Amino acid sequence: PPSHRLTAKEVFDNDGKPRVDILKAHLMKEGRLEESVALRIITEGASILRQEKNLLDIDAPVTVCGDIHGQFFDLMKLFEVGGSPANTRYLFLGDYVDRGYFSIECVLYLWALKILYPKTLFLLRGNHECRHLTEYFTFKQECKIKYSERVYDACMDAFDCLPLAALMNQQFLCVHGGLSPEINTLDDIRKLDRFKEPPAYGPMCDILWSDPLEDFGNEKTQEHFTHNTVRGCSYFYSYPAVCEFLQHNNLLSILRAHEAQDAGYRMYRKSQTTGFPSLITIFSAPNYLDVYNNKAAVLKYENNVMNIRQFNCSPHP
Ligand SMILES: [Zn+2]
């Protein structure tokens, strides 16, 4: 891992676009950047993000991706499986940081790609993109060691600029956690003020934190939303709540991440009327936590086909 800290001119061409190949290689050696350079990437990236909508509007094809949790080296593998971002359209559903030892690298790298491919590649906000979880888990400490608090802070402000939702090919709602009792139409997502720390309660907290019932699709009652005793906040939503939201908004499915799958992913119960899974969980961090031993996966919607690409862990020396 080289004591050299990349300079701005090494990392950005004179036109101000980043040389990601050089960036990726240096970071994969556990390189660091000049703090100067890191801040520029974050703030320039955030300026782009802040001008995006609460709810992004993406056309297919796209490869949609789940949780990373600072597994930088599995992210490099993910791009190999998913296709280069130069010719591939990407949507990430949050949780870029914490748990993994390379959270700052994931952010610097992804934000560099956003600056470079502002209209190909997209980022959603995950529940870890806040002060409260990053203060509790690794990420704030990591920034303090490898760079500074200032970088950490720049990241927090940049994370507040992250859109919450994405409407994909006018068929899918893509969100990190899921639904809210307080979000009934797509317009409701439009009207949220996203530029802030996620509140403890609310429609914004819900999108980021909600989970499907543990027995989703086979529930006892018609029970719709019930406090999420697993997260200790927000809600568990049921198959009938989802089916209702889908029909009312003329949508096909909700794609989300957050709950971590062995498979890499998880179809849920087919919407009664469409014949299509009502909900799909995508988790993109292989051998999560060095103990789950799970596959990761990304979703490739393209040309009206829907592939899923699973992948394993990638190593280091
Ligand atoms: Zn999450």
Numbering used by the authors: 24 to 340
Publication passage describing the model:
CN functions as an heterodimer with a large catalytic subunit (CNA) (59 kDa for the human α isoform) interacting with two Ca2+ binding proteins, calmodulin and the small regulatory CN subunit (CNB) (19 kDa for the type 1 isoform).
The structure of the catalytic domain of human CNAα (residues 2–347) has been determined from hexagonal crystals. The thirteen residues long connection (Phe306-Lys318) joining strands β12 and β13 in trans-CNA is reduced to a standard VIa-1 β-turn with only four residues SAP309N in cis-CNA. The decrease in the number of residues for the β12-β13 connection together with the amino acid sequence changes in strand β13, can explain the destabilization of loop 6 and of strand β11 that in cis-CNA are disordered from Ala283 until Arg289.
